Write a protein that binds this ligand. Structure first.
Ligand SMILES: CC(=O)N[C@@H]1[C@@H](O)[C@H](O[C@@H]2O[C@H](CO)[C@@H](O[C@@H]3O[C@H](CO)[C@@H](O[C@@H]4O[C@H](CO)[C@@H](O[C@@H]5O[C@H](CO)[C@@H](O[C@@H]6O[C@H](CO)[C@@H](O)[C@H](O)[C@H]6NC(C)=O)[C@H](O)[C@H]5NC(C)=O)[C@H](O)[C@H]4NC(C)=O)[C@H](O)[C@H]3NC(C)=O)[C@H](O)[C@H]2NC(C)=O)[C@@H](CO)O[C@H]1O
Length: 154
C-alpha cells in the first residue's frame, strides 16, 4: 500500500478531474469516489460498482470510483494490496500503485508532472498522449487542475 503524500494526493485529484469524476460538473455523493463512468453513481463502497456503463453506441466502460479504475485493475490491486473494501482508501491505494509502477512516483514526488502525466498517460485516457481516442485534456490543463488539487510542478 503506497504512502500518500500531497504530491500524490494531488496527482490523484488531478486524475479525478481529468477523468471527470471529481470535476464539479459530474454529480457525486462523495468526491467522484461514487462516480461511475458515464456519470451515474453508486452508494455501496464495500466493492467496485462493477457496473458496465455504455457511453456511446460504439463504446463501453467499467471505469468507476474517483480514478475511473477499470474493474480489471481494481481486482488486481485490491488483491495485490489486500484491500478490504472499495472505500476511497482502497481507490487511492490503487491509483498510487499504478502511478508507482509507471515509475512516476519519483516524478510526481518531484513535480515532473508532465513527465508523470506522460508516464501515466497509459494509465488514464483523459491524459495527453494516452492515445485512447478518449477526449485527452491538454497537458497544460491537467497541470492546472493538478496544481489546484494542491500539487506542485516543475
Ligand atoms: C477499451 C479502452 O479504451 N479502455 C481504456 C482503458 O484501457 C484505460 O485504462 C487503463 O488501461 C491501461 C491498459 O490496459 C492500463 O495500463 C496497465 O496498467 C497496469 C497497472 O495496474 C500495468 O500493469 C503493471 O505493469 C508493470 C510493468 O510496467 C508491472 O510492474 C512490473 O512488475 C514486475 C513483476 O512481474 C517487476 O519485475 C521484477 O522487478 C524486479 C525489481 O523491481 C526485478 O529484480 C525482478 O527480476 C522482476 N521480476 C520479473 C518477473 O521480471 C517490475 O519491477 C515491475 N515494473 C514496474 C515499473 O513496476 C506490474 O506488475 C503490472 N501490474 C499489473 C496489475 O499488471 C500494465 O502494464 C499497464 N499496461 C499498459 C499497456 O500500460 C491502466 O491501468 C488502465 N487504467 C485504469 C484506471 O484502469 C482507460 C484510461 O482512462 O481508458 C479506457 O478507454
Amino acid at each position: 500500500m503506497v504512502e500518500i503524500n500531497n504530491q500524490r494526493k494531488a496527482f490523484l485529484d488531478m486524475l479525478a478531474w481529468s477523468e471527470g469524476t471529481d470535476n464539479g460538473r459530474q454529480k457525486t455523493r462523495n468526491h467522484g469516489y461514487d462516480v461511475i463512468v458515464g456519470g451515474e453513481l453508486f452508494t455501496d463502497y464495500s466493492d467496485h460498482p462493477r457496473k458496465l456503463v455504455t457511453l456511446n453506441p460504439k463504446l463501453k466502460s467499467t471505469g468507476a470510483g474517483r480514478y475511473q479504475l477499470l474493474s480489471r485493475w481494481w481486482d488486481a490491486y485490491r488483491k495485490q494490496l489486500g484491500l478490504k473494501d472499495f472505500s476511497p482508501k482502497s481507490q487511492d491505494a490503487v491509483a498510487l500503485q499504478q502511478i508507482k509502477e509507471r515509475g512516476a512516483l519519483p516524478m510526481i514526488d518531484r513535480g515532473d508532472i508532465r513527465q508523470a502525466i506522460d508516464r501515466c498517460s497509459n494509465i488514464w485516457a483523459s491524459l495527453p498522449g494516452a492515445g485512447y481516442g478518449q477526449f485527452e485534456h491538454k497537458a497544460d490543463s491537467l497541470i492546472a487542475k493538478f496544481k489546484e488539487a494542491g500539487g506542485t510542478v516543475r
